[PDB]
Design a protein around this ligand. Structure first.
Ligand SMILES: Cc1cc2nc3c(=O)[nH]c(=O)nc-3n(C[C@H](O)[C@H](O)[C@H](O)COP(=O)(O)OP(=O)(O)OC[C@H]3O[C@@H](n4cnc5c(N)ncnc54)[C@H](O)[C@@H]3O)c2cc1C
Ligand SMILES: Cc1cc2nc3c(=O)[nH]c(=O)nc-3n(C[C@H](O)[C@H](O)[C@H](O)COP(=O)(O)OP(=O)(O)OC[C@H]3O[C@@H](n4cnc5c(N)ncnc54)[C@H](O)[C@@H]3O)c2cc1C
Ligand SMILES: COc1cnc(OC)n2nc(NS(=O)(=O)c3c(OCC(F)F)cccc3C(F)(F)F)nc12
Ligand SMILES: COc1cnc(OC)n2nc(NS(=O)(=O)c3c(OCC(F)F)cccc3C(F)(F)F)nc12
Ligand SMILES: C/C(NCc1cnc(C)nc1N)=C(/S)CCOP(=O)([O-])OP(=O)([O-])O
Ligand SMILES: C/C(NCc1cnc(C)nc1N)=C(/S)CCOP(=O)([O-])OP(=O)([O-])O
Ligand SMILES: C/C(NCc1cnc(C)nc1N)=C(/S)CCOP(=O)([O-])OP(=O)([O-])O
Ligand SMILES: [K+]
Ligand SMILES: [Mg+2]
Ligand SMILES: [Mg+2]
Ligand SMILES: [Mg+2]
Lengths: 582, 582, 287
């Protein structure tokens, strides 16, 4: 039973109705940056005793923090911005959350209703702008619609395939006095009618039948499995089927487990990609068959019967036509299959030991590898040390680039929602704000942002947010003085012709630039730089043991390349396993 | 006669066609940040010997720098970004350029054509997203359309009412080989048919007639006059009509001149707003009657005959119905009127000396004022000192907030395009990147970013750009540890109830946070902090005299309020002339 | 009701539009491609493994034949009044089921679909998804131009026919041998039927005749045809129906046959909107 700060017969501002609407949704944390059009909302926020605001230093920081909050908790992330320049600063985050299917509710202030469409002060047609990059959005046109729209926004953001919903609120609506009705019905008849029913037995038994008739089965798991760890784990025990994971699915199945093939795809392991290439049964759970994984579609799992379980019917049969499919929650599908597999266990007698041994040979022949040059720090090694010292239990957020791939390759995530990374949109500047949100959502957790120098500086202003909010965010900065991933493609495909990928100062090219230590010092955050591999272990240990925020600048040779690599639109036979920029 | 790096019969990449297309438009500088979808374009850029790239550290920095480049030169600003997160980072800048009518061409890389609309890697429907916040945009669907589209983009961006044009270029188009045709006709029959004809004599004589019959005429000039300084100056000599300017029009008429009423509007001078209030003739040249200027429309110039000259017919009669209007270039209208006024000078005998004296009384009674508390630095004073030491000849860019208004109030701009400020959208983070573009466009000019602490930190990463590019950008940081303008409205209208407007660290609230000096030190930029008014003069002098970039952290009491202030939607009788947060 | 539709079946869906596969119902097996090619592929397999598969659904087929015998398509004959269902059956017989048939929308459309045995595809031309009245006569025009040697008949309703009656002029001028079998019930029949079943027969603007002369056929469609120089006739008695249709077919060039039908007829069977097989209505009319 919810307790309002207002009397049931007492009129109050629309802004106070909106904040209470958030409280009734169970919101405990928002990331709000004030402005003229959203002042009333911020005033109402101070009157709330249950909602905490984390003030960012940039609204892109705000929305990325809401993302990190969401990805690390499974709860909706909430960001708030003013009209115009505030709203437009959210755009990258909205698109990011849509492509990665992250539950997010964004609230934007708007100019008074009568002035909409008149090029007014700080006016942006944000509903128009963000229509194609949100799951849904709203323009609130009456104070009385606030309770319903807020309820629908949270419902849409969190149900089905999760995604961002934006709610645009005119200033005069925030100022209008009214008595809210909290017991109004949502108006989503179309959406509700298309919500998948629980998986039917006929389809699940079809899958179990294929499993018993296969000899080379492979699990292909992704972001859709993040809430299905126990079920998936149970499924693997009952079948003995090896697990290949997408970038978004890392940790759904324990990466340190023997049955784990780790990540597949463009920079996936040789043995994971091998498994899919030679499989006769592909169990695609919570994945969307993106070309970063599949490469050339006709060659992808070309000899396999494909099972696809997705909660979004639009994804099933999009890029590849499955032999068997289930449109529904993979969590429920796993539960259903686990019961069948258990009851018929002594009848099925599942044993893919020969297939598994074939894959273990591939693990031995072509494991993840890196080269150590003198006392220079291998970025791959730095992440391995982090894994060891944190016992693989840390929450890891990243930027985008080489360091992102290495963070995905050389850290064995034991649970889902440890791994926070922009996959679909691949937005630089994501790491630090996402770590902020994750730390607020998980106050007792070890939170580390494994960032690149290009990515880190993009939202470096959020260091101020970290200090002021006293968040124990660790920054493991893999510093190669380059836009590394672009540099790598220049090396492989453009004869190493540099086109604006160097991030240092050419007038002093053998000096580390900028000095990231001083960025941290500016915000009262303790920091250090390590250059020799021998000192790396103690340096990381110091970062972890030092209470509160900490920045470790890890200097790395820039000639490193991410391996293996399947070229764009290529096949498994095109995989590159050696070479760098030396 | 243009000289290509390719033979007329030699096929070459679409990316090389695009870069040459820019060269043929006379482009000398671009602000490009590389990514996968735009790699080919960046490779082609290195093959150009005439185009310089300034690599930003954030694409918002890139587009804001292109804006500063444009606003300070009158040339189109050119920014380039990759697909997805690169493109979405341009959005605030695009909207900003549209609202302030700034000529800008933005080029974005895009996923291969066949993959458009499939939620591909780093894909954003950027043409959809930016349709309502650009003057026009394009999705290039064939390599052969590149020369025409680039020509149309520059034409549309610079002709009529200037604005941003975005061109989206799929990667496969950049890679396609072709032989370009540079002599193809533009396809803009509708736009060209609506281009205003040169002002007719009948309309200009109508205006001169009203001037000779008026006794209290006031000039109301804005951004549309930025290329009409000589003509407007000549016009004022021939008529003796006092000049009131918008935020966007500052410097069109010399602010230090006796006939200058400086800025009108919400934070305009009392005497400027007085003039408009009691005028019987309002000469609105290159303005759009925005409510920041007009307040309550029915009360604005309520007793005046209104003359409106605008190049955009959609602006004429929008918010206020003029008695006389000219749809055309105000530059040409001024030239036409100046000839008439000169030939009939001894016949007209124009003399508004009585009106001017009435306004001078208002200047004496209610001038721009500020209060000095002990040895604390008045932000208003700091700008006045800057004015004196630079002889009012510096290029000034700003952020948004109190410091922006003071930079507009207490600096006497002698020429147009000295003043670079986000007016319509009012985007924080604009100042530093805009100064970057202005410095590149004007290498010999004194360029100063008058920034707020909230605004400055938003794009603080561009300090790296400044050092690497060796730009002599000066930063005058007015530091009040607050989101000042929001704080002011909290004081006036919300009983000083703070709602997330403090930018320092509450755990050490009497320490300056962050330490902006260390942000500068991180990027090898010399810096200093001044706290006492007595030291302020030498500190600013040191900033100016020190070669290269420099940051001056000016500590200001936060209780300062911007005055005068006409409340939102208010009238001249509602003007606030005293009070602060003390 | 989807949940009840084929509720105990494994579903195979072959469609050339991937957006259709898994839209309303999730198939156990699917093929996204040309069904023509899928059939060719399966036919080769079925032929090569014929003696191995030994397919025989004779028991199932017999179960369905019992249903054919118990519940066939049926209609009732009242005195000498013309059953619209019968009129279409006679047309089927006299054209040997080889005619191109276009229709309007309504009761006559359903009867044209129920009581004519189409032997080949593209004989049946009817607006299904949108269900647009006025489609029949112009569609017959296009079909006749495309198929100059074919028997083309527009089985139309009086409401549907008058909507694009102006195309009679097109038919004469272009000299198209378009036959019009007009099933005339003086009503918007299908709407009238739903009024009877679900609104206690409360008429809401479904009568198309003249209330000032309600037992006169209005309008006189014969004169519409005469206006465009098209020979026409009206038949009212079931006994005269056979010769009348024969005359329409044997008369060279365009021809209009106005077939007067009792309006109380209902299209049967009927499964109510969003209903199940257990809800099927097999008897009743507007009498
Ligand atoms: C530089 C870079 C390199 C990359 N290289 C790789 C690589 O080598 N390998 C790789 O894997 N990725 C790589 N990516 C990431 C890639 O672009 C995609 O982000 C990712 O591969 C897609 O993840 P996904 O297939 O699991 O689908 P997701 O984006 O995680 O979407 C989840 C899918 O499951 C469905 N779903 C959601 N919830 C449920 C549920 N409860 N039940 C059933 N279904 C559900 C959703 O509808 C959706 O279809 C890279 C990214 C970058 C930036
Ligand atoms: C915090 C803040 C406070 C502000 N307060 C004020 C204030 O007190 N006073 C104030 O003035 N502004 C203020 N503004 C700015 C305000 O929001 C607008 O940006 C500005 O007032 C509008 O400028 P403008 O009227 O000159 O039109 P512009 O935006 O500069 O547009 C130019 C107009 O002239 C036309 N034009 C362009 N070229 C030509 C040509 N060659 N010939 C003829 N016509 C042409 C265009 O079509 C357009 O209509 C403030 C902004 C902020 C962020
Ligand atoms: C320079 O104008 C503002 C400066 N600082 C502000 O908050 C710290 N505000 N807040 C407002 N609100 S507003 O005046 O009612 C208004 C506005 O005024 C319309 C009024 F007629 F109601 C028009 C467009 C936008 C806004 C906005 F978004 F800023 F709210 N205007 C300013
Ligand atoms: C992880 O993928 C990339 C990493 N780094 C890159 O440049 C440094 N690129 N560049 C690409 N180009 S791409 O592979 O042809 C491609 C792409 O591949 C389609 C291919 F089948 F042609 C699909 C969507 C976007 C892109 C993009 F935008 F990145 F170009 N992909 C990557
Ligand atoms: C430029 C670019 N990608 C294009 C790009 C541009 N801009 C944004 C906002 N996002 C992306 N992904 C990368 S991955 C460079 C990353 O450099 P880094 O942050 O230092 O990481 P690393 O050097 O390890 O590759
Ligand atoms: C929050 C805000 N405005 C809302 C806002 C939010 N976000 C953006 C990107 N732009 C704007 N205009 C202002 S003006 C605060 C400015 O603080 P400041 O940069 O330190 O300048 P000052 O303190 O002088 O007002
Ligand atoms: C009004 C209506 N349907 C709604 C309607 C309205 N308007 C158009 C253009 N199309 C349709 N389908 C029908 S089916 C009445 C048909 O009357 P009819 O042409 O004489 O055929 P019949 O009486 O056999 O049902
Ligand atoms: K930033
Ligand atoms: Mg790097
Ligand atoms: Mg401030
Ligand atoms: Mg009828």
């Amino acid at each position: 039973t919810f307790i309002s700060r207002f009397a049931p017969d007492q009129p109050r501002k629309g802004a106070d109705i909106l904040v209470e609407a958030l409280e009734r949704q169970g919101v405990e944390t928002v990331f709000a940056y004030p402005g003229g059009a959203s002042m009333e909302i911020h005033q109402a926020l101070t009157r709330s005793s249950s909602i905490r605001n984390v003030l960012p230093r940039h609204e892109q920081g705000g929305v990325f923090a809401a993302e990190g909050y969401a990805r690390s908790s499974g709860k909706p992330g909430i960001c708030i911005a003013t009209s115009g320049p505030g709203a437009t600063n959210l755009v990258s985050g909205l698109a990011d959350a849509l492509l990665d299917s992250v539950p997010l509710v964004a609230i934007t202030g708007q100019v008074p209703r009568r002035m909409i469409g008149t090029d007014a002060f700080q006016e942006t047609p944000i509903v128009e702008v963000t229509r194609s990059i949100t799951k849904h959005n709203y323009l609130v046109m009456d104070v009385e619609d606030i309770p319903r729209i807020i309820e629908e926004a949270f419902f849409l953001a969190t149900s089905g395939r999760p995604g961002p919903v934006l709610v645009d609120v005119p200033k005069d609506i925030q100022q209008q006095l009214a008595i809210p009705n909290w017991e109004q019905a949502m108006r989503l008849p179309g959406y509700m009618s298309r919500m998948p029913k629980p998986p039917e037995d006929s389809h699940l038994e079809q899958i179990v039948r294929l499993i018993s008739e296969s000899k080379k089965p492979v699990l292909y798991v992704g972001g859709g499995c993040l809430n299905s760890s126990d079920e998936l784990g149970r499924f693997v025990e009952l079948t003995g089927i090896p697990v290949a994971s997408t970038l978004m699915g890392l940790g759904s199945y324990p990466c340190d487990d023997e049955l784990s093939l780790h990540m597949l795809g463009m920079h996936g392991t040789v043995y994971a990609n091998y498994a899919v290439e030679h499989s006769d049964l592909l169990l695609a759970f919570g994945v969307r068959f993106d070309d970063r994984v599949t490469g050339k579609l006709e060659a992808f799992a070309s000899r396999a019967k494909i099972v696809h379980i997705d909660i979004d019917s639009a994804e099933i049969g999009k890029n590849k036509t499955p032999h068997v499919s289930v449109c529904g929650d993979v969590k429920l599908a796993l539960q259903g299959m686990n019961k069948v597999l258990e009851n018929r266990a002594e009848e099925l007698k599942l044993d893919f030991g020969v297939w598994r041994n074939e894959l273990n040979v591939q693990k031995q022949k072509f494991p993840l590898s890196f080269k150590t040059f003198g006392e220079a720090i291998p970025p791959q090694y730095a992440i391995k040390v982090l894994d060891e010292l944190t016992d693989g239990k840390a929450i890891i957020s990243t930027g985008v680039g080489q360091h992102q791939m290495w963070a995905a390759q050389f850290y064995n995530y034991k649970k889902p929602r440890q791994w926070l990374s922009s996959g679909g949109l691949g937005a630089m500047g994501f790491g630090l704000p996402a770590a902020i949100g994750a730390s607020v959502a998980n106050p007792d957790a070890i939170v580390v942002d494994i960032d690149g120098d290009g990515s880190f500086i993009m939202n470096v202003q959020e260091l101020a947010t970290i200090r002021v909010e006293n968040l124990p965010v660790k920054v493991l900065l893999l510093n190669n003085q380059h836009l590394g991933m672009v540099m790598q493609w220049e090396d492989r495909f453009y004869k190493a012709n540099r086109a604006h990928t160097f991030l240092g100062d050419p007038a002093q090219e053998d000096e580390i630039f900028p000095n990231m230590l001083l960025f941290a010092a500016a915000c009262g955050i303790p920091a250090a730089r390590v250059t020799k591999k021998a000192d790396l272990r103690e340096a990381i240990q110091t970062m972890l043991d030092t209470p509160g925020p900490y920045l470790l600048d890890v200097i790395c040779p820039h000639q490193e390349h991410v391996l293996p690599m399947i070229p764009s639109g290529g096949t498994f036979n095109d995989v590159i396993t050696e070479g760098d920029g030396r």
